[PDB]
Here is the input.
Amino acid sequence: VRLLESGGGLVQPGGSLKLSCAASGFDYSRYWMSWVRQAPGKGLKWIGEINPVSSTINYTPSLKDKFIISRDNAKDTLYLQISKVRSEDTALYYCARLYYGYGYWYFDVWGAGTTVTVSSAKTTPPSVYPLAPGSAAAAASMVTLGCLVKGYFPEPVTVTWNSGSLAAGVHTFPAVLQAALYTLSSSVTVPSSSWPSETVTCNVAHPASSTKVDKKIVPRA
Amino acid sequence: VRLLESGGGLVQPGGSLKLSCAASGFDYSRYWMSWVRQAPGKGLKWIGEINPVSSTINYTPSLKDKFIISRDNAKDTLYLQISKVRSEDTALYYCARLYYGYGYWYFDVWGAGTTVTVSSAKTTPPSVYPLAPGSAAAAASMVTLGCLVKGYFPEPVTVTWNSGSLAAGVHTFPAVLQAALYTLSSSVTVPSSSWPSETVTCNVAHPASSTKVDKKIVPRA
Amino acid sequence: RRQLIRQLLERDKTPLAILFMAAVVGTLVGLAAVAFDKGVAWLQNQRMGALVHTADNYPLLLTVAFLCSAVLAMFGYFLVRKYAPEAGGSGIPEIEGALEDQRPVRWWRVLPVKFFGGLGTLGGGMVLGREGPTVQIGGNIGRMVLDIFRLKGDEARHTLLATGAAAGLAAAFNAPLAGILFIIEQMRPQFRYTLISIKAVFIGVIMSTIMYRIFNHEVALIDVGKLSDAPLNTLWLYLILGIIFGIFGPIFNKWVLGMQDLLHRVHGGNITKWVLMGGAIGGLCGLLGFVAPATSGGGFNLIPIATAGNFSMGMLVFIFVARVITTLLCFSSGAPGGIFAPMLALGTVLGTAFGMVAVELFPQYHLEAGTFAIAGMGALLAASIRAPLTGIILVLEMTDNYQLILPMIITGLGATLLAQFTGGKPLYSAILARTLAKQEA
Amino acid sequence: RRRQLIRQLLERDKTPLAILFMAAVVGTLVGLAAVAFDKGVAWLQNQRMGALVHTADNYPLLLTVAFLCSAVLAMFGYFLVRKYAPEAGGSGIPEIEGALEDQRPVRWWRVLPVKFFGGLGTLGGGMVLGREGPTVQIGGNIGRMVLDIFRLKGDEARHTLLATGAAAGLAAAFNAPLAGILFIIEQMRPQFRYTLISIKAVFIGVIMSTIMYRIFNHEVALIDVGKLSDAPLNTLWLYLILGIIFGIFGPIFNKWVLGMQDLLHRVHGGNITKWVLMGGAIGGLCGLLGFVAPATSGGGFNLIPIATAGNFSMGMLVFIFVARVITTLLCFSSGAPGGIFAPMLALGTVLGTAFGMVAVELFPQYHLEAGTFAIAGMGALLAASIRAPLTGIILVLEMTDNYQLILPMIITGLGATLLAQFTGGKPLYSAILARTLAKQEAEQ
Amino acid sequence: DIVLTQSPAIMSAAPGDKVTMTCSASSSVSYIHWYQQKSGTSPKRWIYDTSKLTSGVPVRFSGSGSGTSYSLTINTMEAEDAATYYCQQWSSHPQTFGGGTKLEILRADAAPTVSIFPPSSEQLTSGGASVVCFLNNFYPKDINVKWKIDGSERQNGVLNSWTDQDSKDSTYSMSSTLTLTKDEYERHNSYTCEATHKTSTSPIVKSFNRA
Amino acid sequence: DIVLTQSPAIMSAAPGDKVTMTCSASSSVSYIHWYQQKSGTSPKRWIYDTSKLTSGVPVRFSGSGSGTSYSLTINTMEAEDAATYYCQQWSSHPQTFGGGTKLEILRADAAPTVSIFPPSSEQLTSGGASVVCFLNNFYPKDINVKWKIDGSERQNGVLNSWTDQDSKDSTYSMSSTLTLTKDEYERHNSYTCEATHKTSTSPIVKSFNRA
Here is the structure.
């Protein structure tokens, strides 16, 4: 059972965008699907629900076509068409499978979410730089490495180490905005016995420009 | 309800290939699925069948691993693997939906069909030659033109006159094989005033070898 | 005490002769129920065939729809009035009395009358079901083979009468269990013990079901598909609908009974003032089966459409009151044909209506109106005819929506409860009470 | 006698408001109790499987504590029966049947605490007994209790609140309302005279106890096999054949279940302590088997889904069948508190499946799913041993939700009851009532 | 296993005819199915379980028989009935189709329209010569082609190709192509294409001369 | 709609502590649900219908209440519970959410592990020159960064960023991004990184020499 939504990203104020949410692992019918958004660093707000047969669709106090919720029972896919996009609509958008307990409905399985930023700026593929220790580092028990990621728009990005086989020992610092662009780094920590003797790569990935960068950590000669 | 089988074509004797069948228009589960092949200019023969849960698969009295019929209810698709191919396997392949009336089953809905050709000879493009009436011909009411497409393998070829907009009086005969190459002859019959004052072009296509030819039929002066 | 020990060791010992005959009863009933079912459709097809040829001139088609349905009704009423008066109306009242040994089972008369008579009334597109005819013809068929084979005894008599009418309902709705459950809820002499062998009823019901499945396989009478479930906090809405059906259950009885009286004045027992009023009603149904067919006909054709919530609130209310009217006219006029089926249709339209009211009243229960339609479908059977268990198991057999079992049962019971505390009576026993008390008066 | 019927027809379906309100309070209690008992039993199965984890090392030490925990819990069970209510042993469905014939006492003050806490032990040790027995009996006694505490006078109020009790009993035991109702108007009713059982009253009780079970066991079904394949008409005869096989076996099980009672009556000979010790002996064996191959032990609801999917092999099924016959016998016939109803479904499923498989390879052209035959055969052993086919068919249908299999179910079910008749077999629940009633007339 | 054998292989009947095609089994069968196949398209379910007409089939069709013999029946046959009919059982495993029955439109005889051709100048720019001879639109299909080089018979390098009955006239076409190597072709002059049909006793001669 | 608000805005407790947060309702409600959201996860249906637990929630969690005040209670808290817990209802439409109780964890002292990083040679040929300094795994979040370029203190262009409390140890980590140009960076030699923390009275330092 997995909800994997996408389609969000960069749009110019007052415009419109379509949000896709694909599903697999459960009969897509039977279930009412819902949309719930979360603005950066704040709380959770309901958008709208949709029954299985698309024949009862309620929204929250919006307006005309402020939100448009549709589905495709054959595709197993949920849609959200947002119209006339203002800066409040800048949020994360979850699609949620709706179910009940005794009979007051909850939100059962939440997706991972896509980000919708409302700015006039330009889609910027990030730059990745291998921050290795200097030729004057006395490499003790464990040697701490990482890579730098600067100049990208909009949000977000995903840092993994060796496609994920290195989960433990990694911190990925929240993106700080600087002059209409974002910048973050991520620090792996590994044994000194593990490096330079082995492949250490960072798999930076930006979903808005579709780009990915696999920079390998070469020790300074 | 549409059954769309793909994955056919040419294979060299003793090789193998995985035929596919993509289903659209009905809950693909609940249904038994089957493969029926038709030897060009011969009978219909049953290959195998599979039930939804894939827990019963049946093949025709045939050898120890000649067919590997398997399905994936997730993609809504029926697969057939034919191994150690030989000239007998050369035929047109139908995936079929299975249903019943009283309880004696029938092949319910059939798909388009993929031609598998089993032979060692190589994929060779076709030569096109215009067929104008000679320096002795006495044009009556109607006049006969045509163009010969010869020396190609494997099937098919698509011969359309003027991009189809002269589909009256056409005879694109079936091709013949000699020393492992094909040869066919299309012919459109047009009025005595229709030709040669107007332009009659024959368009040939042989996709197996990226061939797309337009051969103009000018008179024999 | 010593008797019971002898009884328990000798329980469920139906003699093989009865069981073999039960099997031959059903087989016949089914075949006939199939034959009757085919004929009725054939004539609806012939009538719709004549409308095609007179498709131009607008008032010409409205007239031939009337005259085809009038003539076919006129043929029906006459076949009843002239050769078997007991075969009018449903006939389910009749077979009930036959089980109490207070009515004659004149098969030689009813079989041909009900069959060919019903064929007229039903096939003209009147608001009558198949049950009436098939249930009656059912018991009569079962009686016939008791006579032809001269089977002696109480057990042989009540059993081959019961299974007959059981296999009758069974083939009427493709609903085996509904048949069996009808017999052990309504048909059985309710006040004394009877020699109805339940095992024998099965065998008959089995056969006639198979007989129907041979001819009508792969096509269901009602197709609604699988609906949404009903959460627990919703159940009270189904009790409320039960109550509403409870108070209306008797109120329909009073009218169906009273309309029999008021229509008895139009003819006064006279054959020709009856038949000519019979074509008058019949023609109106064949006319309505063109101007707004949802007010006419068997009604099985709107149930799927109503349950999907395809009708508007206005539309439903119209289709309800109009059907009330036409249901009354056709059954109360004592035309051959059941009120069973039209009561399902009536209940669906009411259920749906209640569902929609509930839909916008309680958006938080995430309601599907079609659930309430299914709860209410068999509710009018539970309140007017007061056979709730048969109604519930009938609906379940045609809608295949088990997950809606609790709301169904709750609405169903809510109907039977409030149909009691407003003085209402089992409509099929009420007609038996009337036909038996107009024989001693 | 014509003028009486007209007075009767107009006065039909007239149950007094007092009976109906009481029917409602009967069900409510029965359900809660059936929930309480259902919960208690599960907790003990959990506690027992909680000890097996503490002693997961040393192999013979585990096999010992699985026996001793199940032995002591059975020992507790048999004793509570033998010392405080002898009527509460076995099923108790025979007992409630006699109570409706007015030939038995309904000693609720005794049975309730005995059947509840006694059964809790025997079921919780993982013996081959259902919940029905306990909950059906407890059911009737609950309904009797409120007839006594509220002092309701009459024939109607006594039979009805005894019937609905037992009805809402089965209804909460299987989450199967209709099955409860249909059980009462096929089996439970005094089958030879007319009775004042208000069918409308039975409903309200059954409605309540179902709701009461649905409050606690929502969203989790007892049996989930999912929607199966349909059965085409040319297949039906194979269900008839299965009926007939179930038909001849139906009585053959009865003779064993009855005879096994006699053969176990010699081990203890009516003695309290030679019984309890034999009770722990059978109990421990089940707790042992509930580890070495648990398909032989336990309630049985756990293998039904697995057997229907055709996940067992032909060999395994035969083993599961014969071993369960053995363990079903030992636990029920030993007069332990607990019903034979559920284990009969399990036994029928395993047989149905086995037949299905034989049919699958013999008739590849019918495109058979063995799971269909399992479902047809599920309620067949009820239709041939207990001889309540309509109850069995609507019971299965309520748990399997496979209406498309209605004809093969009925046909197998009927085939079971017809061949169960012409082989001299007897309704198992009436046969025990006839034995218990004629064992009272024979020591006088 | 079962061997279905359709008794009339190919056959012709005019629009509005009583057409009856047998399907004889090897052993004992029940409730077979019929399949219609128009040329260049997929088999479709036609008649099933011995006799039942499918949602779409014109009522002119029918079928009966049992056991060892079966048959399809088209009362008032039409244009859109000319195709191939395959009887198929699945009463005994494994299922078997029949050899097939090809129904064709019988029409008023037609004399062929002969066109003979000199190889393109481009084919000879490659050492090859092909002499196409066309025979278009004729009934029936029984035709004997022959070639004459310098007024003499030839049996080498001749490739004949008939067609399936056409849709917009229900006739037959046939192409005969004589392949020659440039050097072998050029040492001759008179190339004739004789067609021997049923429509005339003396043949339709058609030729050309290199000079 | 119904406006809910949650008791503590941010609460902090050490594992072992009995911990209760509250969901307060503008009107009356019934059977409210609780949601969990650990740092940068999507919320997980945690508690529902006032007190039911979702399958796979440590049985230390509980729910209770009615009408105006509903709560959630972690009996003997554990550090793997650090999350912003949301309450939500649907007794009245439209469903509405709470504000959140961002639960924090109290644990012993954890000293930071400093890592200084010299701008990459890819970066040097791109104009930029970000000298990055990691501070990983410390408690509490009270920390102070410092930058001495050739002993001279700098404060222009340093961008700090912290992580949330770690889900299994409970330790924050901090990144420090000093930004310069190719000329500006190469016109020095010794870049230091000063980290003063609760764990040491005397600052923890890290530097690198360009030459």
